[PDB]
């Protein structure tokens with residue numbers, strides 16, 4: 001993934017747990033040599049998965065829970081490190097934001113030429129609920145998606161109830177979530 005994802009993970013860990021801990025994770029992740037992540041440069045996806053795995057091993061929480069925290073953090077991080085206006089442009093409610101998300105990543109992808117973005121399709125079941133289809137070229141990021149949804153709930157001051165109803169990792173086609181939301 002592009003370096004800014006890896007910077008966000010370093011930032012979250014460093015902010016929440018201090019620099020010393022970060023270094024132990026980075027070493028455990030096999031990344032001691034990498035002096036710093038370059039935000040606009042592409043890295044092997046392995047780098048990200050290893051950081052998350054090393055974070056779990058060092059701080060002893062399941063990786064799924066790290067991905068959730070990271071997903072939530074990403075909503076603030078992007079808003080604060082150069083993508084505040086882009087986020088604002090994608091709307092001011094959860095269902096509108098989710099409808100715009102593919103176009104938001106198309107916009108990111110004009111700037112990050114090698115981007116492999118997720119794909120999100122909404123099927124609205126009422127004015128306050130939807131089924132969300134999440135398609136990805138990657139494995140294991142559903143929990144990041146749960147955390148991102150919670151991040152968006154906070155951004156829009158909206159209560160978001162999310163339950164995963166289909167799983168990419170089993171045979172099923174792709175991850176699906178049922179979501180209810182209200183203000």
Ligand code: HEM
Nearest residue numbers: 001002075078083087108115116117118136137138141148
């Ligand atoms: C705020 C709501 C957002 C959500 C819910 C979201 C969702 C996701 C998800 C689930 C992924 C994981 C990749 C995959 O599924 O294959 C991802 C990747 C990524 N997103 Fe977004 N995203 C959001 C906002 C943004 C913003 C504002 C940016 C601006 C930079 C951004 C840039 C990226 C980048 C660089 C990647 C890594 C993909 C790669 O390197 O190929 N995202 N996003």
